[PDB]
Amino acid sequence: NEIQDFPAEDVQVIVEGNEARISMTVYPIRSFKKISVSLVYKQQTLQA
Amino acid sequence: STNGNGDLDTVKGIDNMKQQLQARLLTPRGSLMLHPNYGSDLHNLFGLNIPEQATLIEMEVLRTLTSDNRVKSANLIDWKIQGNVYSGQFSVEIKSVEESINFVLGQDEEGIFALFE
């Protein structure tokens, strides 16, 4: 859990001569610093 | 109350049974002198709004109705909960005409013609 997620498909490698070029995508790890929650009350009727 | 003819009012038969069942249900148990078991525990059953308290109320009501000797049986019909308000209804089968006739005609041998139940 140092990173969140990453798509394996994006990992592409180009090799040419003495040079190696790599592309990737990574979703950075994050930490919660806000929680918003909504509550709703409702009536209920029970029978039998 | 008065009967309108300057004499004390009187309830007979079904009206009597209504009066006695209402009074028993309304009377808290143990409050009546000389009669610990007469009454009901409904004054303490003002609990939460869940089926459990409904079942407690129903069981207490069935106990209170069964306590009467004349009530051959009682049973739940339907109940519901509307938040604060509870509602329920019961069915009471009093002793049949045949049994009451047999009891009264047997009482002729003694001549009391009165009820000490």
Q: Map tokens 């038969």 to a residue.
A: B13
What are the residues whose beta carbons fall under 8 Å from the beta carbon of B49, sequence distance 6 or more?
A: B81, B83, B84, B86
Give resolution in angstroms. Answer: 4.4
CB contact under 8 A, A48 and B79: yes
The beta-strand segments (E) located in chain B are: 71-82, 85-94
Per DSSP, B44 falls in state: G
A7: helix, strand or coil? coil
CB contact under 8 A, A45 and B51: no
Report residue B105 as tokens.
């005609």
If residue A2 lies in a helix (H) or strand (E), which one and from where to where?
A: none
In chain A, the residue whose alpha carbon lies closest to the alpha carbon of B51 is A46
CA distance B89 to A16: 89
- The partner residue sitting opposite B51, judged by closest CB among A43, A45, A46, is A46
CA B41 to chain centre: 13
Solving technique: cryo-EM
- The backbone torsions φ and ψ at residue B113, rounded to the nearest 5 degrees and listed phi first, read 50, 50
- Specify which residues B28 forms β-bridges with: B40
CA distance B99 to B110: 18
